[PDB]
Amino acid sequence: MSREEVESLIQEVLEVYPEKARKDRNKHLAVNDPAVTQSKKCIISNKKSQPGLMTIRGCAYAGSKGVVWGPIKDMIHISHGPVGCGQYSRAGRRNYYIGTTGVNAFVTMNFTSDFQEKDIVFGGDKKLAKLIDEVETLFPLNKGISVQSECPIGLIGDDIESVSKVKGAELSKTIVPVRCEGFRGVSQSLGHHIANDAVRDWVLGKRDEDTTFASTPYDVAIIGDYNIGGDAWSSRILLEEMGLRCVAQWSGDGSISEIELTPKVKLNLVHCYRSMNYISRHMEEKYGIPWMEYNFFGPTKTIESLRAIAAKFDESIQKKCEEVIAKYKPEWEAVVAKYRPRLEGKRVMLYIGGLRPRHVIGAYEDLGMEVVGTGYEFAHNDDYDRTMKEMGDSTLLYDDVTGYEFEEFVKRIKPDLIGSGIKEKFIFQKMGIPFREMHSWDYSGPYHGFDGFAIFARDMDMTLNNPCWKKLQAPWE
């Protein structure tokens, strides 16, 4: 499709809307121009969703509890408020960990204060204090508690900070109040920010006056990898084969001690910019630790990233870098040789959260596939700045896409594959368009690193080329 054709498609789709919604949505839909470096000239982002249009976005609680805090494996995270939020988000996100669940690790459990009417009317701070005592009784090996506020907590005027301070002092325990109520912000995004500030304020400085940890020049932290299907493990292995020491993973398979040790590292490696840039900046301000963005999706990006990271160290790490690259070369070349001929020229449309809509484009390209549309639920313009040079000229970009828009764009563009979430998956399969979940990895993965690329390629091929897609039309029609 040409630029003019895509612009025409945008206008046609916007025709259905009332005027206020039409004028708003026009600002969130763009035809890419990789020449443009200031995305605030071509798209608006990180605004409220228009009422009634079936946004795919979540809320700040999803961004704090579900995304940043929930994966920390040896803390207990309390979903504080009524029963719904904790139940829907219980074990929905595949932030993998090693532990003994219910004993020393708690990630897939749902702890809640299960607010009733009396708690709304008279407040939940006494309940929260009693709950904390019950947690301590029944889960003695927990290494700290977080309190993940749901919508009612700030609305009724509860003071969870006071409860957290008083109880934390009484039990000599880290108890972290997190004001991530879903009424705050416009999406998951502000939950990330809230959650990062809560780490800063209540956890990260605990060991500021402790000199016992033995640092090395090769100490790093992986910042913003939530170990979906083991993604952080398949990243960590490469960093360590290159001779670095990965002191912490934020927050997939993460422990509270690893977070507390992070101010001791030499370099913060940021995968998810959107969710963890906040704390990365803080650590540069307070501890002088530099940070850098990287990308472990597909061999081209993974190799570029290993080299860029190694360049921050000495010749010994640069030599190990080339060793790592040489080791895995035949493995990813075999993946390409098998799967690229099966996928070459196929066209994909993506719609994901705040990082993957640009980050996975290289891996598609490594299999000869073209990303013809992409967009984000809750990205900011700094994300779009990073996107426009990764995407082809005249491709389609969509911010906080409506259900209606996404369906109509797909009908015109007729991509060979769609990569999006669970709320989208079954729509597009009924249309006869191969669909891969690009949040949960469709219960597969990992996709990061060299070992992840093999699984990614397998997965895109098994779905795009599946025999089921030739069968949607009954032979009598």
Residue 426 CB, shortest distance to Ca ion, in Å, is 4
Tell me whether residue 252 or residue 354 sits nearer to ligand [Se] (CB atom).
354
Assess 51 for contact with another protein (CB under 8 A).
yes
Residue 52 CB, shortest distance to another protein, in Å, is 4
Q: Which of another protein, ligand ICS, Ca ion, none does residue 329 bind (CB under 5 to 8 Å by kind)?
A: Ca ion
Assess 441 for contact with ligand ICS (CB under 6 A).
no
Tell me whether residue 130 or residue 329 sits nearer to Ca ion (CB atom).
329
Q: Which of another protein, Ca ion, ligand ICS, none does residue 257 bind (CB under 5 to 8 Å by kind)?
A: another protein
Question: Residue 48: exposed, middle, or buried by beta-carbon count in 10 A (0-12, 13-18, 19+)?
Answer: exposed
Q: Which of ligand [Se], ligand ICS, Ca ion, none does residue 352 bind (CB under 5 to 8 Å by kind)?
A: ligand ICS
Residue 280 CB, shortest distance to ligand [Se], in Å, is 16
Residue 427 CB, shortest distance to another protein, in Å, is 5
Q: Which of Ca ion, ligand ICS, another protein, none does residue 35 bind (CB under 5 to 8 Å by kind)?
A: none
Assess 275 for contact with ligand ICS (CB under 6 A).
yes
Interface ranges with ligand [Se] (CB under 6 A) = 63, 67, 188, 275, 353-354
Q: Please count the residues of the chain.
A: 477
Q: Which of residues 88-117 bind ligand ICS (CB under 6 A)?
A: 93
Is 180 known to sit in a ligand binding site?
no
Assess 356 for contact with another protein (CB under 8 A).
no
Is 59 known to sit in a ligand binding site?
yes
Site string for Ca ion, 327-366 (x = CB under 5 A): --x-------------------------------------
- Catalytic-role residue among 93, 179, 193, 274: 93
Assess 352 for contact with ligand ICS (CB under 6 A).
yes
- Catalytic-role residue among 28, 80, 94, 192: 192
Q: Is 93 a catalytic residue?
A: yes
- Alpha-carbon gap, residue 445 to 424, rounded angstroms: 20
**Which residues make Cβ contacts (< 8 Å) with residue 235, sequence separation at least 6?**
222, 225, 271, 296, 448, 449
Max intra-chain CA distance, the chain:
77
Is 151 known to sit in a ligand binding site?
yes
Sign of CA dihedral 426, 352, 89, 458: positive
Q: Which of Ca ion, ligand [Se], another protein, none does residue 354 bind (CB under 5 to 8 Å by kind)?
A: ligand [Se]
Assess 230 for contact with ligand ICS (CB under 6 A).
no
Residues touching Ca ion: how many (CB under 5 A)? 2
Q: Which of Ca ion, ligand [Se], ligand ICS, none does residue 476 bind (CB under 5 to 8 Å by kind)?
A: none
Asked if 73 contacts 255 with a C-beta cutoff of 8 angstroms, the reply is yes
Assess 99 for contact with another protein (CB under 8 A).
yes
Assess 354 for contact with ligand ICS (CB under 6 A).
yes
Assess 423 for contact with Ca ion (CB under 5 A).
no
Q: Is 448 a catalytic residue?
A: no
Q: Which of residues 125-164 bind another protein (CB under 8 A)?
A: 127-128, 130-131, 133-135, 137-138, 140-141, 143, 150-152, 155-156
Asked if 155 contacts 38 with a C-beta cutoff of 8 angstroms, the reply is no
Is 42 known to sit in a ligand binding site?
no
- Catalytic-role residue among 25, 28, 30, 59: 59
Q: Is 62 a catalytic residue?
A: yes
Please work out, in degrees rounded to the nearest 5, the angle formed at the alpha carbon of residue 65 by the alpha carbons of 51 and 162: 105
Residue 63 CB, shortest distance to ligand [Se], in Å, is 6
Name the segment binding ligand ICS (CB under 6 A); options: 140-148, 199-207, 351-359, 407-415.
351-359
Q: Is 192 a catalytic residue?
A: yes
Asked if 150 contacts 82 with a C-beta cutoff of 8 angstroms, the reply is yes
Nearest residue to the partner ligand ICS, using Cβ: 353
- Alpha-carbon gap, residue 247 to 220, rounded angstroms: 6
- Alpha-carbon gap, residue 244 to 281, rounded angstroms: 22
Site string for another protein, 70-89 (x = CB under 8 A): ----x------xxxxxxxxx
Catalytic residues: 59, 62, 93, 192
Q: Which residues are part of a known binding site for [7Fe-Mo-9S-C-homocitryl] cluster?
A: 272, 439
Chain residues binding ligand ICS by CB under 6 A are 67, 93, 226, 228, 272, 274-275, 352-356, 439
Q: Which residues are part of a known binding site?
A: 59, 85, 151, 272, 439
